[PDB]
Write a protein that binds this ligand. Structure first.
Ligand code: NA
Ligand code: NA
Ligand code: NA
Ligand code: NA
Ligand code: NA
Ligand code: NA
Ligand code: NA
Ligand code: NA
Ligand code: NA
Ligand code: NA
Ligand code: NA
Ligand code: NA
Lengths: 1001, 1001
């Protein structure tokens, strides 16, 4: 209290504030107290009782008013109500979720906690039979953030490390019969300063609570060591077992390998089948002492770094990864097992082979599923101090000696829990925790304890205390330099030499927020080309949307700020490949294609395809290779082709049946036809059914360019309207008012789109750091207006005429514009529309050149569209730097399914590469043909889309908004990481393009 | 059409769009057509008929759909409805007002008009008797922006120059009996590009429409020349008269001067009383020909620039000015005469002596009122091209030869209308129109036509074509350099020499938006010290608020964007000294004091005062000098003192009656008493009643500093509360929960206030151009939180104790804080509160130091306050760099009258310099004493104030928000011009201060 300003004469007086002792504990730097030693999560035959279920719960707003009313004895519970456990309690109407990204939601003065600090008191009465005596423990697999535990009124201890397990000995405290377990949980504690992950703040007892008997002569911990010698094919096996901190005699049995060996001895198993994400071979094993048996699944694999490559079982691997948080839209950090199983299958179904547990250990039962389904796992300790960065990392716990014991404890618990799982191929120290002596201490502890797994940590770019060089969101350009080993040197020659000898991983890349991510293919090409590049993990698997309801009961996802937060980061928590209910976003469909493990390159003459097996261990024997030829009328040919199995990293040429090329050779010129070759699962796997598609390639015979009609109809002039065949025009605006009877409310040029999440991010570098969306607003691109310059008819053919409508498009207060001429022609059935765009003045504003979203047309039609059909790419959306998963073909969707249900509505739903489109408007069909154009159809305007913050803000107005774009820009990943690559940016230019239109009934 | 991209084979076709001819006319560079020569507005005995009244009106959205249906004959009017004329038609439910500041509301491509261009068709039937034959004309004193006029179906011509007069000969077209006048008015035209004033866009026939007979042998124009020779006292008189463009014989009679002379001859009048704003002497005159007589008011004055000074009648003058727009909150640009008369009286009542007609000629009848009441007028031509600045002035009309005739026409009409008025002392070419050849042409035309008045134009800083050096919002520092003649040189030595020989005027300064303007006194000191400084004109006289009603019928003022504008500038149109209904803002009350024309410096020993007459021409004989001594109980002494008249620019010492000093000498030490000496009007003037206050000065005997109580009561400790005499504290928060029975909901430190309009402006210069409001938001200053560190009692006196509550104030995600200790003491009746503030960490955020709004306390009391009384300054608000008009005294106001009704609610209502305050809360009174503190009391929180965009957003919640500030920052003028001067900025510091509190009943 010396820094506090007042100085009082006399000796110090007594402290009168309430709650001083509770707050002193919450502000403790200690890693909790009273717990048993950290150990593995082990399946054992020891009796077990889950205490999950309906508990009693009372919430107080802070420690100083949290009652000390003997509630732990369970006799006075008038202020308590039912609450399920496990739970994140703000998901059940107690307080509210709060989202921050980097910023802490409390003043940064470690270790101190704010006065507003929700305290949740939990209580359950349970029965314990004789099998839990004399010895038993209570296990808590997660408490956010600070728990104090009592049993029958006796304090057992405290928990720190919110996603880490704690166990408490209850021998001599547990009683036969009824027992009362009480747990006081503080939302905030000193630990909050090291738990600043970009996710919802959610207090609770959010994982299992278990009573476990500890029979005499049992097994407390087990450490499986299961290596693979790829030269000899041998497994290298040693299973350590301990009780009470001492090595014990136990018997290890592995029936499938005909093994019975002693614990603690290393043996060579003459032939094992090694474990990989591709082939996750597991051997069932048991480790047995007199009083207890532990069941294990052993996968034999060895991890090595050599020649600047990350190798498993002697081979460089490619990580096709995602960052997986634990989130459920209605349960918070509680993820039901069926949801976990389904989402891991969904990952495999989209070609993912690797998971980073961003940024804390997962539920303990996740590891066995990863072992079984096959993922390379980066298992990350629960540590993130990101919010200290804004003060230059002043007071960062990672470098503060007072935090050493707490941070080493986090790493020890992380490592000990999950050390037996073959899927764990790297330990990660944490995320965005800066640099410091405590991270070094965590690394040293881990390397000493478990030298079998390399250490990962992105926060220290010098990589002094790690085994791989990790970065997040490094540009494609920088990744290419690193891939070639030619990045700039570190200042320290010794550190530079070490880091240049390290393989390189992107622990986060291609930020998948909203419409995006763009630029994935450019990273993937590098990963495949350069051995030092290990691959990357997309940020992130899921959107953390939280289900809410409007006043009328319309369900939608909420994000930061939807829960009254004073400080929050908005929709940055909805930044995934799937929504919170695990529905794919288009980015997942594109990603699947980008990382597909086979490359199928179909010959232009349709005689065959080149096949490259991009897997590391498996051949192609799991796949059936299918071909199909489709034309406008439907499939013309199809079947299967036998492919002799191609070894990993090998390539072959496969001949297709002669009927396919004969078909190609017979096609009329200009008739469209698509040959697709697909690799599907030949048989059910653990993660998908036979017929599931893994890879594909195509060859397309493109339709001929559209033929404008002969301009043989003349312009008929009336007082207020002009008629040209099936088109009627306003003489006041020059715009069509109907085409073939389809009412047209507006036709005009487009240059802008409703900003994506990426367009709301700053594009660092250069002198202009305004987000693109702000550049557009400042430039008036969202508020264009059109002036009519003139309308005239010109001589056509055989008495016909064309009609040229001259316009200029600009914005209020701007001098730059584009002259736009529309030239219309018709033979009475088809309409030709030529659009010519010429800049009039430099598109520069506030000293920076204005980029465009598009060069296109918006037709506003005075009727609703029922069905949208097109030839192009699909079925899902595609933009210049996305759409890898959109394949060539003929597609048809009801209008509602053209949209994409991003949580914050934004530009989406364009189908790039379209050659023809057909919109069904009641009883008429409007057909559009062009050289490649992008197609979008919506039931609301761009201004409605831009203004909407949530999906219920969208409303259909009875019209159809049809967008036909001659040019589009890419979407990039500027919300976090690279913006649109140069080749996909759209700079102002002069342009012309032709469309043909037809209305049939 | 060559720039338009499409190229069509064959010869060009016929134009098919509608409205081409109307739009061609609107896009014309010509100054209108068909009008009679520009001339003076003259009062004549020729028969006159006002056609103002109920007309018929039809609105179309643009020229292309404006009907050409013979409506001008008045036979088919089914689409017409009644509309008063004169009117701004969007004030009557036709379309909507639209506010832009600089930005044009249409694409900038001169001379072209947008498609959305409201067309208002006006029609009236009137009767003309025989007195209007054979010759008559129709006069239009204002049409915004483009009128086409028909009478009985015959086109008379067109109008351009929205605030300029046009007359059309109707001889041979007017018929005896009924006539039909039709006027098509376009909102936008090529003229809009030269009418970009910062004000509402309001189309209409917004000034008088008059039929005037033109008898034979009449007088068409008159040019009065009336100079004054200050050496001899002579007037120099020549009155020119013309008819049909030729000089005529006419007789000039000036009865009061015993004159009968011929028009066109210069005479010397041996003794005249000269005209000035202080003494606006006017002589009634008549100029008569056989068929017509013109009545004139002649003021004799000569204007000269010599020795870098602007002189009238041989003396340097001081301009105490405002910029006057024409605006009415319900009628738009129509200002009723009674409103004009009242507002000019109000100006005189606040010591104003000068008006700039920003930025167009006023109603023609304004000039005679200015002549009569006495203002120096800067009469400004209707020209402003400000919106071209954002493109580097590309295409600026001022430098485009095609606009020469139009711009010279504007200046000619401006000069000719008002050239006879003594009040006009400068012609201004326009405002914010850049630089160019057409401005030079306007200046040359004016100097040739009327060399009697200097030319003003701020837009060309080289001053090549003007006679005074004018700037807007130059800093006090730059003004001081200019005042001393030591500003940097222009590159051209010849231009630099000319400009250094010019007097200097601020045509706009001390931008008066919202809470402000600060910094007025620093300008005024310079104006008074340096002869080259002519003075300045405040921006601006009035707020252009427009009266609107909420859903429930609550009237309030609207501003930009409240009328659906796509592009607008928000509340920048509400930036005046008075609201739209001419109610003073506090800035006017302060300004009155700043520019007061006498300086009264009261002696500290109360024996007398020094008096300086700061007028230029008048002595002090119009004033009665009053004194009063006031004490807590009321007035102790008062009366009048005879002052021998003090000449302009002279000073004297005036002895006060001995009773006043005897009173001062007898006062007990520490007893407060105030001596005020006032100069009031001794007799009714034309602009105020006898007793009206013009100037004042004070001497104050300050109350002694507060004496903290002896700390003889001890702290009583209860389970959840502490009691210390009359104060009860929470043991959970350390805050008082009641003081003497007054409920206290919260007590805490304040550092922030709800941003003023100035705080929302950028502070140019330095690397940080964020507005202060944004700096505060980024720093979290608007979201402070308090942590309780401890509560302890310490030994007091004779068994009593003090209570120290230690806290820390910070914001989420920030490391900087302030330690705040509160030390409480009491003797059972009075409470002492010592607050000590110490910074803990540097208040720096995003690399820039964080400034504070205040260092103070917020008491939130759980009851409503009825009445607020204080000793300090008042009655109105005062901040460190404002409050000049707040005088020392005792004040008492109901709570509602403490607030200030700014249109956008914002920080306001602080009373700086307070020594004691008393709040009546039901049956209790809370009394506060301190060394100088600022006092604010509100019925809603700062967050409610900040969130409110209009006054109906404010809501009382049943509490009292009491602010006691030990330190406050100034408010400056950063919305446009200088921010807070260094001496009034509030940087983070350590501070301590003492208050005493008492509750009586
Ligand atoms: Na322990
Ligand atoms: Na690689
Ligand atoms: Na995120
Ligand atoms: Na086969
Ligand atoms: Na594609
Ligand atoms: Na939106
Ligand atoms: Na004329
Ligand atoms: Na002066
Ligand atoms: Na303004
Ligand atoms: Na007198
Ligand atoms: Na004052
Ligand atoms: Na406000």
């Amino acid at each position: 209290a010396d820094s506090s300003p007042h100085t009082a004469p006399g000796s110090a007086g007594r402290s009168l504030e309430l709650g001083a002792a509770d707050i002193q504990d919450l502000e403790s730097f200690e890693a909790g107290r009273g717990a048993l030693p950290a150990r593995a999560y082990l399946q054992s035959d020891a009796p077990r009782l889950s205490l999950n279920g309906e508990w009693q719960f009372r919430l107080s707003p802070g420690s100083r008013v949290a009652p000390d009313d003997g509630w732990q004895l369970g006799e006075a519970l008038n202020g308590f109500e039912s609450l399920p456990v496990p739970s994140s309690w703000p998901m059940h109407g107690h307080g509210a979720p709060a989202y921050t990204n980097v910023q802490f939601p409390f003043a940064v003065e470690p270790p101190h906690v704010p006065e507003a600090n929700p305290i949740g008191d939990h209580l359950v009465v349970f029965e314990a039979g004789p099998e839990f005596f004399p010895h038993a423990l209570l296990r808590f697999d997660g408490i956010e953030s600070a728990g104090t535990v009592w049993l029958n009124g006796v304090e057992l201890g405290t928990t720190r490390g919110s996603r880490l397990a704690h166990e408490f000995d209850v021998s001599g405290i547990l009683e036969q019969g009824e027992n009362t377990l009480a747990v006081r949980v503080a939302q905030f504690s000193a630990a909050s300063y090291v738990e600043d992950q970009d996710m919802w703040w959610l207090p609770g007892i959010f994982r299992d609570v278990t009573l476990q008997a500890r029979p005499a002569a049992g097994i407390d911990d087990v450490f499986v060591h299961a290596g693979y010698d790829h030269i000899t094919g041998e497994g290298i096996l040693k299973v350590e077992a301990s009780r009470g901190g001492q090595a014990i005699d136990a018997v290890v049995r592995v029936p499938e390998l005909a093994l019975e060996l002693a614990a603690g001895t290393e043996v060579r198993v003459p032939a094992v089948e090694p474990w990989s994400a591709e082939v996750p071979k597991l051997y069932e094993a048991a480790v047995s002492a007199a009083g207890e048996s532990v069941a294990l699944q052993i996968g034999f694999r060895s991890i090595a770094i050599e020649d600047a490559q990350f190798k498993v079982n002697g081979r460089r691997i490619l990580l096709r990864g995602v960052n997986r948080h634990e989130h459920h839209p209605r349960l918070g950090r509680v993820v039901p097992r069926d949801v976990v199983e389904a989402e891991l299958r969904l990952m495999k179904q989209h070609n993912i082979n690797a998971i980073r547990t961003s940024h804390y250990p997962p539920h303990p039962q996740f590891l066995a599923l990863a072992d079984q389904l096959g993922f390379y796992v980066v298992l990350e300790c629960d540590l993130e101090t990101h919010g200290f960065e804004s003060a230059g990392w002043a007071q960062n716990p990672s470098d503060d000696p007072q935090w050493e014991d707490a941070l080493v404890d986090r790493m020890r618990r992380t490592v000990e829990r999950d050390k037996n799982h073959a899927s764990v191929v790297m330990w990660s120290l944490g995320n965005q925790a800066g640099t410091g002596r405590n991270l070094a201490a965590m690394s040293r502890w881990t390397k000493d304890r478990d030298p079998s797994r390399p250490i990962h940590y992105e926060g220290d770019w010098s990589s002094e205390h790690v085994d791989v060089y990790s970065r997040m969101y490094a540009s494609q350009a920088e990744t290419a330099l690193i891939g070639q080993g030619i990045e700039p040197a570190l200042n320290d020659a010794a550190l530079d030499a070490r880091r240049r000898a390290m393989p390189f991983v992107l622990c986060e890349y291609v930020h998948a927020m909203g419409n995006g991510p763009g630029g994935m293919s450019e990273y993937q090409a590098l990963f495949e080309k350069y051995p030092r590049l290990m691959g990357g993990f997309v940020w992130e698997w899921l959107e953390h949307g939280i289900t809410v309801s409007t006043a009328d009961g319309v369900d939608h996802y909420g994000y930061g700020g939807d829960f009254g937060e004073e400080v929050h980061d908005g929709n940055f928590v909805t930044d995934g490949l799937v929504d919170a209910d695990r529905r794919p976003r288009p980015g997942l469909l594109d990603f699947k294609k980008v990382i597909e493990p086979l490359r199928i390159d179909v010959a232009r003459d349709w005689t065959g395809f080149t096949l490259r097996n991009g897997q590391d261990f498996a051949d192609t024997s799991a796949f059936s290779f299918r071909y199909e030829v489709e034309a406008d009328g439907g499939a013309l040919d199809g079947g299967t082709v036998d492919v002799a199995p191609v070894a990993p990293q090998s390539e072959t040429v496969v001949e297709l049946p002669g009927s396919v090329a004969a078909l190609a050779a017979g096609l009329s010129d200009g008739r469209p036809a698509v040959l697709t070759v697909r690799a599907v699962l030949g048989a059910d796997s653990a993660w998908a059914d036979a017929g599931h598609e893994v890879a594909w390639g195509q060859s397309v015979r493109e339709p001929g360019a559209p033929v404008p009609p002969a301009p043989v109809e003349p312009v008929q002039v009336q007082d207020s309207e002009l008629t040209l065949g099936p088109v009627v025009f306003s003489r006041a605006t020059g715009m069509p008012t109907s085409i073939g009877g389809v009412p047209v409310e507006k036709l005009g040029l487009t240059l802008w789109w409703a900003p994506t999440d990426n367009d709301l991010g700053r594009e660092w570098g250069g002198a202009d750091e305004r987000p693109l969306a702000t550049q557009w607003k400042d430039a008036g691109l969202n508020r264009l207006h059109t002036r009519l310059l003139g309308i005239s008819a010109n001589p056509g053919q055989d008495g016909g005429e064309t009609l040229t409508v001259r316009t200029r498009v600009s914005a209020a207060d701007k001098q730059y514009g584009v002259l736009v001429d529309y030239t219309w022609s018709t033979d009475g059935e088809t309409v030709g529309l030529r659009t010519q765009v010429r800049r009039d003045g430099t598109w520069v504003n506030r000293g920076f050149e204005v980029e465009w979203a598009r060069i296109g047309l918006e037709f506003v039609l005075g009727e609703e569209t029922e069905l949208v059909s097109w030839f192009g790419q699909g079925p899902h959306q595609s933009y210049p730097d996305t759409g890898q998963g959109a394949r060539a073909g003929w597609f048809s969707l009801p209008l509602a399914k053209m949209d994409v249900e991003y949580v914050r509505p934004q530009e989406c739903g364009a189908r790039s590469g379209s050659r023809s489109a057909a919109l069904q408007l009641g009883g008429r069909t409007l057909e559009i043909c062009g050289d490649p154009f992008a197609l979008t159809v919506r039931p609301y305007s761009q201004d409605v889309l831009d203004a909407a913050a949530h999906r219920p803000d969208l409303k259909a107005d009875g019209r159809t908004y049809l967008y036909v774009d001659h040019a589009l820009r890419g979407v990039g990943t500027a919300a976090c990481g690279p913006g649109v690559l140069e080749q996909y940016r759209l700079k102002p230019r002069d342009a012309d393009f032709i469309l043909t239109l037809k209305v049939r009934s």
